[PDB]
Paper text:
To further validate this hypothesis, we used geranyl monophosphate (GMP) as an alternative substrate. This compound contains the required dimethylallyl moiety, but is twice the size of the DMAP substrate. PaUbiX appears to be able to form a geranyl N5–C1′ linkage, by virtue of the change in the UV–Vis spectrum upon redox cycling in the presence of GMP. However, GMP binding could not be detected in PaUbiX crystals, which we suggest is due to the presence of W200 that likely blocks GMP access to the active site in crystallo. Indeed, crystals of a PaUbiX W200H variant were soaked with GMP and subjected to reducing conditions to initiate the reaction. The corresponding electron density obtained from reduced PaUbiX W200H:GMP crystals confirms formation of an N5–C1′ bond with the geranyl group. The lack of activity with all but DMAP(P) substrate (or GMP) confirms the first step is an SN1-type prenyltransferase reaction dependent on formation of a dimethylallyl-derived resonance-stabilised carbocation.
Residue numbers in the entry:
A (entry chain I), D (entry chain G), E (entry chain F): 2 to 196
B (entry chain C), G (entry chain E), H (entry chain J): 2 to 194
C (entry chain D): 1 to 195
F (entry chain B): 1 to 196
Write the structure that this text describes.
């Protein structure tokens, strides 16, 4: 149930634990994850978390495999200019893509179709193939430029799922609020939530 | 610095801690608060927090005054159909209004101008007087209907400030994330801390 | 089983209560769980157009409809118009499909604007944000531009505008044949067999 | 009271009983009817009804006069390419036009101004002369293409009256539902109703 | 996997080899094909290929069955005015439709909802049923009218797949470029590309 | 002689490098001055799809392309992606026409929004503000609504959207026949003869 | 009177003298300036003026401090990828921003919200905080793409102040025409002369 | 090369030197110029320049002929209500038109089609005949009203060439900046320098 392969992209918005928690749940659900991360997102993760993420893909692939307890080849990391990567072509891309968190800059590039890196190209491919594309922005306030880009992508089928956790399950910690959004993302993708 | 009188409206979106914390900070900054709350918001607050507000405005005004340690007359509560309340007319309304949290239904009514209660009429008055109007929605995902209503109000001058706390100050508790959004609301209003 | 397991069926104050009752009956015989909602105006419509004595409060209404359709225990669930704890009010718990049959012009407007003033309008707002099937069955003549604009906007967002306009190419002999035509299209739109 | 000359066009939408019943009431109300019918509507009438309609206008005029009990010359039938017919020119056209039923193709042609036959040209003339134009579509569901065509024409003054009969007069027959829509059409035209 | 019944329409754009190759692949995948072809497309196939396609539907069905080695009844050909054909109604139409190649005229008619023939009506039905509709245009340059009609249909859920083959598999023949587009069509429909 | 004397030919990272190489060859045989631009992604596409070993640096690239097409001295001029002093970057010095072939969806987006992040996008922006012919040759399937919206906006402003969609009504026998079809349409759009 | 801290960004449009003259006037008005400059704007300044700025921010800060005679810490230069710089976040950014001159590319990125460097991110922050954002484009002719981006930013509150000096004070030198535009920028910001 | 006859209209925007310099270069390029000037532009020229322009057309034609050294009949001046003038009809109008400088009012009238004087009617004729129409506005800041009028006209084929001179040719005088804009107008029209 749900997509077997998911492209997980992390961009330079605040909330790196949303993406790390989502990656861990996708691994526990035994899904193949094509992991992409921007240069700004690597700076965010080093600023907000105690996760020492390696810079190059191969070292990053081995780190995240140990960090999540993933099986061999379950996590695949690709550089930001690796156009030969599966997510860059329609016939080879995973059946679903999540950008979590999604910076306002990546939200702008996906809305305009800039395709300046692998993350933006993979989102452009998901839209032209009409595959699930979930964007998780973190920004306050939302400008009209942010809202216009979100509305345009939402009108085209993309799911605008902001990092706005709810409080109606009486959260006790920061991780409870992170798990709220992550479960919302798995719910949108059609993947069970074994928290 | 900042508005002396603020209309604080709470509607039936999740995140009643945001509005309670914002009310407390406005009281600590010695601002006069015209407090409004919807029926659905009262149930949200009783569901998510330990605060069950008295229903009638006078008993609700005494509760919030004790809850926040406010001075006499600093917090003024008005019913949802009290059109004689200050926030309902342009000449008497407080010069700033915040809907925190702002449900998708209240976001709908403000965008269309429904004015079916005092909260929606007060937001309509704030727009026609071109006074600060801060909306704090809590919803995931945002549908195109939600985004269209936010974009229209954003284009008209309202500040769309979603309940999306940041993590770049390394929060350690739920209260740190609530304080993140409340601090952004006060900065939007021009109020210290 | 093919199609939605659980369906939110909302009846609003448009004429054509026979459409909603016949649809509820067919959904029960196809062994679907139905979360039944009804407005105050629709209760007055059913008392005016039909001889069905529908109880006013939910618990008595649930027992009446269970006996009316011959449903199993718990197959039909009735919720009040302000029951925000009902499953259809939240995305995580809502049924995976919703039908508003019949759909008044007032409910059509509220769903198009997102008013969320009752459980019916909030459930439709949830179905749109979760991108789940939302079928609207309006009954009105003529269609003003306000009606058509609200229908077009919801049609552009993925909702299915299925007006109560039965066809005659199966040579109907009774009013029930025309009622069954519209109900058959609703079940076909949802992906549910029709006998 | 009301227009004394009516252009009645039938196009290939289901519900030929609506058009035949409307023609019958217009004859009973002593109105002159300029009757037009498309090739697809002739196939619909033969499929849905037991009415054996002749193919070309002169025989069709004598049949409809006998079928409706009309006076001599009360009904005038014109071919689909008779550009010399009154409804094709502004000075000579009847000052009211009804397309009942109105197919999605005719609804599209009127909205775009195709003027490919006498029916579409007559509707184009009615719009440029600011004369009443009533369109009775029969389709379910309404696509966004259908709704935008209806919205554009309704914004221009045309009346979009879908074949959506009401049930608040407690109908007991198919003919009761047909008379509901016909009565609304006459009500829109300002013509009295008399069952 | 994928739809079992396909409506394959060929219109008067250049690239008849695309449609013939797609028909052959759909047959090899054991899919039932409802084949439609316009008069202009018949002239295109006679001009670009040496396939002698019979004009009448019954002889065309026997030819295409022998041309692709299809089973009995696997290919069903319907005339351009056969409104009784399955693709003309929502209840009976195949669950997916492809127009390959798609003329600028057919692209125009589908965008406006002209429904002047079976091909245009079947596409209009696919849109109101929200079933897959893949359009394969062949035109250069694309005018603003072409792009506006493509954008409107793409915004409604139709897949605009232009006959623009890629070269990144290093093609050696014209057939390699034809297979590139056909493979993209099958992948869009969710059908394997074993062949 | 008819048509523009100087043409800016830009190749971006869309599939179909044979289209641009064939167009450059035809413009050279028609004795046109070509200001050749190429993106880093297009250099990867050419190395992947063709057996053409294109040098990376501009001056070594200009010598290779001059010998590849048999051009005269100075007929082909190659400029780096950040060479803002290049003629195509300014309205007074830019060539009379510009062709982006092939045109990636990213370059199509940057021209539609006016990003001007490299010389190719800046040259296209200059061609639009001077109202000079701008031909875009996209290669993508399917076309998303984002692609179509960017194409419609540029087409509405005067740019020629010429997709890499070759026709079959001349009964082609090879891949190059289909490549020559698209190139001939580009030359017809520019007003240049096609005695290829 | 006027903002005490201003973000001054220079992008690769012609007219580097406008930004240098504006930076000088802001320094003489005792304002704190968060100076940002693009790679292309450095090439423009070296082409049109006698000023070739040191590339790194620290050496550029000392050069501009000596060039304008600024006090210690009055001018602060930040790199194009310094996301920790004050202008990149709403709570810490200066309350006014000027992009002078403003390239057609930066005008494009601010209109779409590209946020690809610190300059474009700072302008995006200024718009979401509803703070003064002044864009000074230099281009001729204006294409419809340029005008569409300017109209969108103008409709959102940004001030489109093109480098189009007037002649009604009868200028006698290039410096008089530069001072015309700089005077209008300061008047737009509420800063005297 | 380029149009043989050009309609040159001067309206009440600042920058009369642009129009006078453009008229001079069109004469040196042996072009026939149909010169039009608004009453507001006559006041701008008297304010910004030392050029004593006569008020009525025939004396204005003789002055401009001697000011530019034009041949006999090369410059033809027409009044603001001379509807029989060549530029007022499509069959008789010159092949190209330039409004330099272009006031915001004339920009508005051309965008709406007011045709209240010969200048506005001539621009309306140029658009309906699809002939080159160059507008040179001088205004700062550009309001959204100005930008919307410019965008509509540019979408219709008109060239919006603002009086924004560049500095990349290192100008040494006001005349160098004037010559920059004039050179771009001539290059837009297809006329050499
Ligand atoms: C003292 C501290 C820690 C201060 C932090 C101040 C800010 C800006 C906080 C919020 N925050 C943020 C935090 C941090 C640590 C960094 C490095 C960057 C951001 N940015 C800016 C983007 O990265 C920038 O726009 C890239 O250009 C995107 O590139 P890409 O799309 O990833 O390729 C951002 N963006 C967005 O949208 N929402 C956001 O909350 C933030
Ligand atoms: C086995 C059976 C009974 C099959 C019938 C299946 C269908 C499609 C039923 C509904 N139905 C219908 C019925 C019949 C009998 C025919 C011949 C045609 C239609 N069509 C198609 C149009 O005629 C077509 O689109 C012409 O091209 C319009 O031409 P024109 O405007 O009249 O000139 C239609 N259209 C529309 O809108 N609503 C509608 O309910 C129907
Ligand atoms: C413990 C459980 C199971 C709780 C259910 C949680 C649900 C259903 C959603 C979260 N949540 C929410 C929580 C609770 C407790 C209640 C009572 C209501 C809401 N609603 C619905 C609105 O109140 C409704 O739409 C009123 O009609 C608005 O009226 P008003 O504008 O205030 O006057 C809501 N709305 C919105 O936007 N974002 C939101 O997160 C929520
Ligand atoms: C007997 C009866 C028949 C009605 N018929 C219609 C109808 O056909 N269509 C419609 O839109 N409204 C109809 N209405 C009016 C609606 O009920 C009314 O607008 C109401 O406000 C709808 O509220 P709801 O959307 O909560 O049901 C009818 C009302 C009654 C009592
Ligand atoms: C040999 C031939 C090739 C054609 N090529 C194209 C083409 O590539 N694209 C296109 O849009 N039309 C092309 N046309 C024109 C269309 O056939 C024409 O517009 C026709 O009206 C389409 O009708 P249809 O949509 O019913 O097929 C071609 C026609 C012929 C005879
Ligand atoms: C071998 C290869 C083939 C590609 N095919 C296409 C294509 O057909 N269309 C497209 O838009 N992009 C294609 N891409 C992706 C683009 O190169 C990518 O979007 C890049 O960002 C474009 O940058 P540019 O516009 O500067 O060339 C391809 C890339 C590679 C390496
Ligand atoms: C000397 C020089 C002068 C330039 N003049 C202009 C100009 O007047 N207007 C403009 O929009 N771009 C001009 N450009 C081009 C821009 O620098 C180029 O588009 C660049 O990508 C802008 O990058 P930025 O927005 O990061 O500064 C000029 C470039 C150079 C090197
Ligand atoms: C000395 C002077 C300078 C002016 N400067 C400008 C200017 O720079 N831009 C502008 O749009 N209008 C300017 N105006 C105002 C216009 O002249 C005024 O709007 C007038 O109505 C324009 O009329 P016209 O379009 O018929 O010339 C100026 C006026 C005067 C007298
Ligand atoms: C004590 C009284 C009479 C109060 C008046 C109440 C209202 C809503 C006045 C309208 O105010 P406005 O004109 O819309 O701003
Ligand atoms: C011999 C005659 C009377 C021919 C008239 C036929 C038509 C359709 C004229 C156009 O009429 P209009 O000007 O568009 O209203
Ligand atoms: C020293 C040199 C060659 C400077 C030219 C640099 C540029 C790109 C000028 C822009 O020109 P434009 O006015 O925008 O058309
Ligand atoms: C041999 C390889 C790795 C080719 C990669 C192809 C790419 C990057 C895009 C084409 O894919 P699409 O046609 O746009 O879906
Ligand atoms: C007697 C004469 C020559 C009068 C001049 C004609 C005018 C002023 C406009 C007609 O011109 P147009 O038809 O609109 O292009
Ligand atoms: Na790019
Ligand atoms: Na409400
Ligand atoms: Na038709
Ligand atoms: Na840029």
């Amino acid at each position: 149930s749900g997509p077997e392969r998911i492209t997980l992209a992390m961009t330079g918005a605040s909330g790196a634990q949303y993406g790390l928690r989502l990656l861990d749940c996708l691994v526990q659900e035994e899904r193949e994850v094509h992991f992409l991360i921007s240069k700004a997102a690597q700076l965010v993760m080093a600023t907000e978390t105690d996760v020492a993420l390696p810079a190059k893909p191969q070292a990053m692939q081995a780190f995240l495999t140990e960090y999540c307890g993933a099986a061999a080849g379950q996590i695949r990391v690709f550089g930001q200019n690796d156009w030969m990567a599966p997510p860059a072509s329609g016939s080879s891309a995973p059946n679903a893509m999540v950008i979590c968190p999604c910076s306002t800059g990546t939200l702008s590039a996906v809305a305009t179709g800039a395709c300046n890196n692998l993350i933006e190209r993979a989102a452009d491919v998901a839209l032209k193939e009409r595959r699930p594309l979930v964007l998780v922005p973190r920004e306050a306030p939302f400008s009209s430029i942010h809202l216009e880009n979100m509305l345009k992508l939402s009108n085209l089928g993309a799911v605008i799922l902001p990092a706005a956790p709810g409080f109606y399950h009486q959260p006790q910690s920061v991780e409870d609020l992170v798990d709220f959004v992550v479960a919302r993302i798995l719910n949108t993708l059609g993947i069970p939530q074994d928290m």
